[PDB]
Specification:
Blueprint: H1 2-18, H2 22-38, H3 42-58, H4 62-79, H5 85-98, H6 102-116
Helix pairs in contact: 1-2, 1-3, 2-3, 3-4, 4-5, 5-6
Subcellular location: Plastid, Chloroplast membrane; Plastid, Chloroplast thylakoid membrane
Function: Negative regulator of tetrapyrrole biosynthesis (including chlorophyll) in chloroplasts, probably via HEMA1 repression. Inhibits especially the magnesium ion Mg(2+) branch of tetrapyrrole biosynthesis, but independently of heme.
Organism: Arabidopsis thaliana
């Protein structure tokens, strides 16, 4: 049941995002996050966290967005599993830019580009 709902919620969250409905997307991704945590599936947890971060960015909620993109980074370190960290660096940089935090934006941006150069 939970694995299927998790799959479903990630899909529907992404669709809401694509259709410029970020509040509805947030709801879906928040369920996905809870289910992924219950299932102890950090890979899916990172997808939910990214979705939350993106949904919050669309809403202009940049500080909250950083909280969720930062989870992608934190889970990746704990699991030694690198999926999604490049995108997270760039998203966090973008958030700090909107917040006017040029110092932090620059640090994350530099890492983002450095990582893209190794793609």
């Amino acid at each position: 049941p939970k694995k299927q709902e998790l799959i479903s919620k990630l899909k529907t969250g992404k669709t809401f995002l694509r259709n410029q409905e970020p509040e509805k997307a947030y709801t879906e991704f928040k369920i996905a996050l809870e289910l992924a945590q219950s299932l102890k599936d950090p890979t899916e947890e990172k997808k939910a966290a990214r979705g939350l971060g993106a949904s919050l960015q669309r809403q202009g909620k940049y500080r909250e967005a950083i909280q969720y993109h930062s989870m992608v980074l934190a889970i990746s370190k704990r699991e030694s599993e690198d999926s999604g960290i490049t995108e997270a660096y760039g998203a966090i940089a973008d958030c700090y830019t909107e917040l006017g935090d040029l110092e932090k934006a620059g640090k994350f941006y530099d890492t983002y580009i450095a990582r893209l150069e190794t793609d």
